[PDB]
Amino acid sequence: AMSELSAIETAAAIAGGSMTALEACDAAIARIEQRDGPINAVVVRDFDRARDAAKAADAEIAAAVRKPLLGVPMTIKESFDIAGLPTSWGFAEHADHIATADSLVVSRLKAAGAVFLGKSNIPVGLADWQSVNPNYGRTNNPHDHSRSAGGSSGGAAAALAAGMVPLEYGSDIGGSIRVPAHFCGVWGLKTTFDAVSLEGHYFPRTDSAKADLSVVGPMARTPADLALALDITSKVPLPQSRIANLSGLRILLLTAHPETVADSATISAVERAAAACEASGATVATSSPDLPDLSALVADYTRMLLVVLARGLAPEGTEPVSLNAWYAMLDDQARMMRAFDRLFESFDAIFCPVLGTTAFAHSDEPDWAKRSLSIDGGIAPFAAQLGWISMATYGGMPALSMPLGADGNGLPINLQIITRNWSDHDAIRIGALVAEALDR
Amino acid sequence: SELSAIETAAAIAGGSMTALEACDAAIARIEQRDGPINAVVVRDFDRARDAAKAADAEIAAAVRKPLLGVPMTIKESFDIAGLPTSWGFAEHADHIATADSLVVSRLKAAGAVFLGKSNIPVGLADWQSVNPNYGRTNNPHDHSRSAGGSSGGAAAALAAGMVPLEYGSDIGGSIRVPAHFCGVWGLKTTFDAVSLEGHYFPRTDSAKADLSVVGPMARTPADLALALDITSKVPLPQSRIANLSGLRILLLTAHPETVADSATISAVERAAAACEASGATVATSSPDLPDLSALVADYTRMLLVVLARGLAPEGTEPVSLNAWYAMLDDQARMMRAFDRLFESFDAIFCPVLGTTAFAHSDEPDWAKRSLSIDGGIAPFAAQLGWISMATYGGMPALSMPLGADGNGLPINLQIITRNWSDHDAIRIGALVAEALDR
């Protein structure tokens, strides 16, 4: 009913003359000041300098200059660097750390003409499926202010779902792009590993970006905005999709995991997307002899994630992992990556839940081991849900989180579409085709 | 002169010759010329003739592939199902691979026929090609000098005209140095742009995840570009450079930690001068050129760790995983320093190595080795600085024929371009050849 312009639609209106870049900037500033009160998503604001960049974009528009995102207002996850703006990752010690240079993703998007109004909220250390920190506060889900907006790119997904900005960009090392888009019912693409540069996504007061597991990708409300943002930010132009329809598509449907569980409403929602593809000409399978050991994957992924997040350091007394043992873990990862290369020889995509349930209620327990989730009235471990996102992060494959529907309480349910490595554009295309199939 | 890889595929698809005829003609050139050279040390001629007969059947079905029926060889470190992969070790001579490597799969899918594999040093750890399993490869321009390493057999087979295409690996110049010694074309690719799946250490599934790259080797720049398009993880950005006019070239004939021949210095200077006459701008210094003396030191400390798999001699303390993560951040800092350098320059022109092909050496320790630079003795291991920038920075580096020294040994030029501009390095190289032939 209530609808906002997409990133491509905004650029088309500015290039045509329906509106100016300053009008689009001021319209988004209005939506932020009007709607971010109960949501607390756009926690870093640079509206004055954003209006100056929109006035410069209209000068280029008047100089007949045309760029794919010229004048389009947007925000980015607070973990990305913007010159003049702070980068804190939620740490109070790092709230006065002001970046001196823009991040690569910001440079790429600015070079396409985008205007950055500010940065979206995050949890402390980007280490939660929530968005809460002592510098900015807590971000609330626009669909139910009592539930989490997700994390670590929760402020990004909440700003999108509330219609404040049409485009965003987040990071993902343990679902931190797919889970926020799942909780807020927006579009988020976990990209292929090493496909987009993490330069500028630095830990505060360093130049260190994660060299393992972590990926940065676009977040939006339309698959076309995701595809344009991917082409603007990738290290090289990635292969465009040649999938024209769902006929002939090979889909592996997974509604269960050896180490975690999913809602009945979640299972029926993912099963409904697969059925919409079968009626559109696709073939869907529920088992494969080439599906890797997901129980070993999640175990090997968790052991690597904790080492990457700890920078190889160990608790006092505990012996650290050796460099030789780390090299052995990378060979274990590459062994799993090829196991998925063989799986993706018989299947075009994996359809599975993003997470086992919808957005959970706000939690003040920092320890994931002291948390639990309600799966159809039952008590389930919280951290075990990392298995739903382990395949794409540990295998490196692109994974799309796209809106599928909502549960009985109105909380969005998203679908995870996993395709083979470097087929990010196929994950976007299959997702757009799933949306068409579900709207018929 | 021999046919190139593209010319061979064009003659097979046109009907000038068949794929079995091209296979048998390359088998003939190998058996006729590899006697004093010893480059094609693993031979699969029987199964190669069966694959050429299958290519001719596809050719007769109007099927057309870019390398359909083209006979070639690959460096012995690459896996081919049914063929051994030993890396020169006697302990690994009976290690037969069960599946083809990724590069071999890509090239076979483009229609290439693999006649065999080219010689290597033990452990791929020398600028020579000699091992107890196959013997020594000799430079086709002077059988007393090294053919290069670690992909020396590949460059020697190309220089002798046996096969039109080859593929090697490079962690310390092992693609550029062999092509430099034999006067052929070799592309050190951008890091992580081509998969090393199948380039496994014998009897493992472990491929180097740092510094090392695999790239094409040929005698024409156009053959390099086709093989790159066939083997890269994704189609890489094609070059839009049409001529040398307007090109920004940083000419480097000196290094803070090593030296170059006077004939080498004049050869690289002659390539740079040919570009100025074609409209290019050439500079001899840049305030944005990183500290090459620190680069080689940080690269050498990382190279030794990668080659040792993090292990340390007894008594010596190993490098910690935390310290390793810091070394990767030190590497990325240097990579961004080159991103700024390549904002003012399109390419770096510098020597591949400080001198031409050296005489066969039996000293395993590089610290006990030396090189003859214009009558003087210069350290051997210090020459790693000529190849350190591209490997440690990740940039693509092309080794292309420039000429020969006074003794007839080839001198090649190293063309370094920015990361992911592999096709620009090939294009600038092809344009350097045109300018020097005028």
Author numbering:
A (entry chain A): 15 to 454
B (entry chain B): 17 to 454
Provide passages from the article that reported this PDB entry.
SP2 shares the domain architecture of amidases, with an α/β‐fold containing 12 prominent α‐helices, 12 β‐strands, and five larger loops. Structural analysis and molecular dynamics simulations reveal that the flexible loop L3 consisting of residues 219–226 is crucial for regulating the hydrolytic activity of UMG‐SP2.
In SP2 and SP2PMS, K224 (part of L3 at the perimeter of the secondary active site cavity) interacts with several water molecules and H215 (as well as S222 in the SP2 structure). Due to the steric blockage of the active site when empty or partially occupied by PMS, substrate accessibility (in particular for larger molecules) is limited, in contrast to the complex structures with one or two BBC molecules bound.
